[PDB]
Design a protein around this nucleic acid. Sequence first.
DNA 1: TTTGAAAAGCAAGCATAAAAGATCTAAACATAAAATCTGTA
DNA 2: TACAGATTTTATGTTTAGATCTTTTATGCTTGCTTTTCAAA
Lengths: 35, 248, 544, 85, 225
Amino acid sequence: VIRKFTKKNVARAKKKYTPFSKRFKSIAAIPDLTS
Amino acid sequence: ASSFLDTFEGYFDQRKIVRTNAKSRHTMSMAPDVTREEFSLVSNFFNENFQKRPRQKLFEIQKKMFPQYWFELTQGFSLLFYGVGSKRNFLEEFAIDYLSPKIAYSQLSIPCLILNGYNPSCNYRDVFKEITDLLVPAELTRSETKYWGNHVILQIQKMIDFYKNQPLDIKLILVVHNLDGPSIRKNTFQTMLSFLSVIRQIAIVASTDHIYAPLLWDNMKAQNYNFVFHDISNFEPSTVESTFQDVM
Amino acid sequence: ADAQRSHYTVYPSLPHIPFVKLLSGKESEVNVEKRWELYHQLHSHFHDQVDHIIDNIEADLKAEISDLLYSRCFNTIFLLGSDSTTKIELKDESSRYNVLIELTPKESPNVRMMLRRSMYKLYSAADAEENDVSYDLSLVENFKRLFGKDLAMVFNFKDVDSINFNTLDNFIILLKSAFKYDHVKISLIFNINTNLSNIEKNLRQSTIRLLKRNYHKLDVSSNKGFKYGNQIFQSFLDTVDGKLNLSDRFVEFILSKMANNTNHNLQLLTKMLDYSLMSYFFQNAFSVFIDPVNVDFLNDDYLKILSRCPTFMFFVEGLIKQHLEEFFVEFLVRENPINGHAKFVARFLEEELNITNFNLIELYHNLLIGKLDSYLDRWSACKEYKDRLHFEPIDTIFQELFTLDNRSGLLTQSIFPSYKSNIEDNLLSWEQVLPSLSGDLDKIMAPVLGQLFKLYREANMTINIYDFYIAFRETLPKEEILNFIRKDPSNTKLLELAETPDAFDKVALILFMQAIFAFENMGLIKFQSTKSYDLVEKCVWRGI
Amino acid sequence: SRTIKLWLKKDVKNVWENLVQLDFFTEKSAVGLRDNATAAFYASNYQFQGTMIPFDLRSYQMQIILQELRRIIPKSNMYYSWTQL
Amino acid sequence: CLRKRIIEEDDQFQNVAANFIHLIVQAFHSYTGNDIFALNDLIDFKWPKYVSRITKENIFEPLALYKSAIKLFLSTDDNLLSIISKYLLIASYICSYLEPRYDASIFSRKTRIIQGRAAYGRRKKKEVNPRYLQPSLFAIERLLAIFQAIFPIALREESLMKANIEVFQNLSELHTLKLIATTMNKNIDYLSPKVRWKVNVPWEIIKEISESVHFNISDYFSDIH
DNA sequence: TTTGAAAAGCAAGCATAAAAGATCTAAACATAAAATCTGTA
DNA sequence: TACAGATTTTATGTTTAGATCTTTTATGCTTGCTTTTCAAA
């Protein structure tokens, strides 16, 4: 595949995309974040 | 006031110089003030009552022109309607109520994509997106995209070469109200519809209002359009097209 | 509301030919179906030959472009009168790759974009036949090191008259730098639509001296020597031979309208012939009589309308000075050999006298009137063969029932209308549009656009809008308008506005302003301000 | 009148282009070389009005004026009398 | 070429080559300036035509060979529409290089019913020579009025020319050919009344165009300068 | 045959539209590494 | 569970289309003055 330009100096951080609102089932299922 | 009225003699004759002692400096301050509601009410009264019967008689006269319009559309000619007065009701009644089910019956309905040229929000990318949602063409390869090309025009040029080798059945009825409207008159937009008008499988029905509208098309664009011109003057009120031009 | 939107798709509901019944509704449906089938068998017979002529002219143009292209400088070819629609195919030279690069003025905003698009096209083609590189002229430098073969680039410049000539000039000197590489051959193709004197004055003199070392002119168009055109016209004549006649006014209208179009006159000729065939098979009930199968149902209406003929009336006047259905059938077997005469004259001009630059349409015109000798006197080579090449135009009774003519103004109303003049004559007259049959108001009060166009026409170039409103207001009867506005008692606000003493000054003003913005939308008027609306000036004069 | 060949416009065009090349004439109100790459990139995407009209109508301005021409052209030159207006 | 003009008809060959180079320099140094490349191109263009006039009499005397091939040293030789379109271009040049006030004196030829006085024309001849300057801007209706004033020609024949769709098609083609320019170059709206028009061709092309259809356009500029 | 008189031409000056372009941005077009989603397994 | 591939997300570069503001130049109105043919005597 012949590329129309190249980005050969891409430095991408290892940072995830899923926010905090979708890692628990409900509001009442969130544990105590202090502990 | 002038010796000549018409031709170029009248044009050069009526361009004299007027002295400042006859300046006629009257203004619109010396006018009866109106607002939206009474203007709309009395206007719609004169549109729905004044000379409604002979307009309806003329409309019933030009209903008999419809088989000739269908015969022109099946031979590859695009229809352009002109004349003083609005032509929205004519094109919506001809394309939807008459042309679509009779084309569908003659090839045994056909979808109608209707474009509002009086609206300045009309855009060729969204209209072509709806076109590709209807016709579902083959998507452009990498070699056919070239180098930052217009993907819309290149994909229509692919569709032209595809649809040369198809059976000549009308898959889509395209209606362009006010082809000479403000956003819609631009060269890219006219190139897109001329290239669509090359395709025999799309029927082109369009209208126009500007008196200088044949200046919009050169020899290539007029060849791709391939117009049959029809004078339909009816003195329709133009109720809908005036909504994008504050009259106050 | 979908009418307040940009684009909406609707699907009509459903609960078959566009041909109508002729003879005031007395014609049978079988004649309508036969006329449909006869129109299609003539239409397909004409357009198949049109397709073979279009394929042949494309193939011959490709052949002569290849012959000029393959026979330390550019190989330059100027295609004069080129509409940039040709597909230029290149042969596969052994051990060398031939690459076509096409350039559009939209694809050429500057020299850098031209080079980047050209080098991307070159690398894409070379990889598509045989790690990435920089899209730059160093790829031409290292082409043999990266692909093994050598290179032949053919540049085709679409629409050179519309390009920026400084950008094209700098691209030519930029491409000149590839001459120092041993493995590079560059050809340039310029599609010129005006002439060469326009393009030699826009390039610099060093560029002209660079392009002069190897260049070929090639004037290829549709009007070049009339060959392609005459073939289309002869195909149409061979379609209608033995059945239909062409009028001299029709042929001269073809010549006049084809004179006014130069670049695309061929498909214009096809369009006019197509619309003439459509008109004949839509109008005439005798269209089914062009073949001898359908002569078995001639009714009283056919005999009624074939008796209103000038040729038949002349013939029976000659017979009563000297001295019906079977006699009408008797005028179908005849040949009318004018088409064979025209093609014989064309062949005699082509392959005996070696004359190619003749117009067969104008030749057919001079054969139709009978002035062939004055047309053949120009070449000064048919002085002794004019008598054998001349034949009298025969007159045939009932020719005008099988005739493509132009007397009603139909073919100049649908294909080449006087658009602006049509708008002006509709606005000024207006009784020729609306029928003369609010029962009292329509006989005394004009429509607002037509009433406004009169005072538009009789005013001056700059119009004060309030005096124009006053002149509009003096043309309206206030008592009849107030009587008509009180006709409907079911609208309360109309009745409470009508009894107000300044009602007519409201009504006439708002009808005037809706007509003024209608005129502004059509483009008849404009405002000589942006923030003010006090003076208009007109842009449209009748008769121009 | 008081010989020297008159050259035609076709041949004076090349002389004119060399005089433009040697920085004797400049295009009217020309910015020229830009300060940074962003402004030069913006300039490269714009079609100037001088590049679309024919060359015989392009407006030019002198880099050397006639008073400076009279100073350094030698008095034995045959066109020296025309350096004074 | 030089080794075929001798056989089929080395110091002397160098003498002919150096004499040709000196003659090219003497003829065209005023044209090229001190450009090596332009003189190289002229040497390339004029060498074979100089070889093709070298005979056995011209090889040993340079003056007779210079007289025989004189035509190569006097000239540089470094070089390579419808009726409606041509009259629209001519009318465009008229609209760009005449003033609108003087149009009523040149083109008006109609009998008057209502009493009125025609324009007198310009009072004194100015010396500006307006063809040396850039063209002025005009409107569509003035273009069409002058176009039907200058176009070639009982109760239904309509002698004058209507502005039908093919005149506008030819005008759009003229704008496509870049022979007519506008103030806008991209995103042009053709229908706007604020868009003005100008001719894009010089005088040396409209002379050929006007003489191709035999129109006296040089009479129209004789009243000035 | 004149004759005065209104239509038309020229010029200076000032307010103002308009062209030309400098500067900038949104959007189309284009690539690309990490995270995330299917999809069997 | 579990890993390989496909798709999405996020991030950045490339090119085109178009808007906005600024500056210099063309143009049109105003007033005064002078030329020049035109309906009437």
